[model samples]
Target: VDPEAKELIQKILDRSEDIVQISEIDSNKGEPNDQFGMKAEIFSKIFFNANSMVHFDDNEYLNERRILYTSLNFNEGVILNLGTILSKLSQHSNYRSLVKETLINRGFSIQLAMEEISLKILNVKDKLHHLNKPNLKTLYYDFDKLKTLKEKWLKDVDDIIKEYNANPELRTNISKLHDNVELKNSKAQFADIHNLILNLINTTTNILAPIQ
Candidate 1:
């Protein structure tokens, strides 16, 4: 991997660590109702940098990061799926009163569902753990760091979506949700970060490109 690539990856990893810490503290305080938004904010940075590895035209590292992205993205999908299901269930008037019973009536086993999701997360973590161990130069990506960030963000988004879906007050004003002050600020931040990442990618690409 190029030194520039390594530096960029390091910056992203560092930022991700910060955001994860912030999210952890915020969750404990029961604030920042938009956990997923924050998670997405960080992910946008990581995904862009990882994807940018392609510009180096280094198939070895490119292939490795591609696999990493696939797993990371899939994990996001899993959380989204869980959130969507939970949201729908929450809409039922009796859902809160009998969560387990509702799931059983719907032929959905909470135990099995949770177990499956847990296993998937564990498998990914195990893979990352092994990959992060000091080893030969063959592996260049920080699998554990990226996985931790990805998992946290996906879960945050899941929680926010689930909360939004369950809240009748919020659901009734869904149209206004987009214009929320916090949401707007988050969107602005995302745009700013995305542009910054794009510029970095362009610079990195230029440096990595072959000479004419």
Candidate 2:
């Protein structure tokens, strides 16, 4: 058993639970609000699939196939959850308007911060779907395609981080919106998502490497 692979898989599982916790909190309102519950369910399913992938043993080919399928499922879950959030945000135009009004009330001229952040989210979601497409049907048949997809995912993630770091206001705007929605742990949620992606990247790297 490769210890590094085990550790990376563990991290992904843990980070996924962290994301599920955020959705849980959001859905905990006494009212009929359950928008985030479905997101939580997606992450939970990813966690379950990943746990099942790592629990079995011994056959190298089987293990690789399991990991590949789980990784694809992980990306799918992410894409689905992102789409859910984007749709929810759009559905709640009042919330969007509130965020814009709040930003403007604070004397910030850029009313498009919410739009910009949503666009960024959309970009990441699209790239993840793109990364998953070719690998979906081919599975482990094409290492080169897998490597290409992995690189694209890493670069897209890196680009987003660089953009966010260079633009502090964008981050602030996201937090503000989350705060308005009572998700005070928005930063941690973002961190969890980021860490999960990093873990996924490492898992792909390990998958591409020779099995020990």
TM-score of each: 0.30, 0.22
The candidate maximizing lDDT is 1
Which parts of model 2 have CA positions greater than 4 angstroms off? 1-141, 175-212
lDDT of 1 by residue, 80-184 (tens): 444344444334434422322222211122122222323323333313222222321112232332344345444544555665667766556634432331342
RMSD of 2: 18.8
Question: What does candidate 2's lDDT look like per residue over 1-212, in tens digits?
Answer: 25544443344334334433433443332221232232232222222233455311223223222232222233444434333443344344445443222212211111112122223333333232233323322322222333344444334334443554576664557544344333422445435544544454455444323322
RMSD of each: 17.4, 18.8
Candidate 2's error at 178, in angstroms?
11
TM-score between model 1 and native: 0.30
lDDT of each: 0.34, 0.34
Residue pairs in candidate 2 whose N, alpha carbon or C atoms collide under 3 angstroms: none
lDDT score of model 1? 0.34
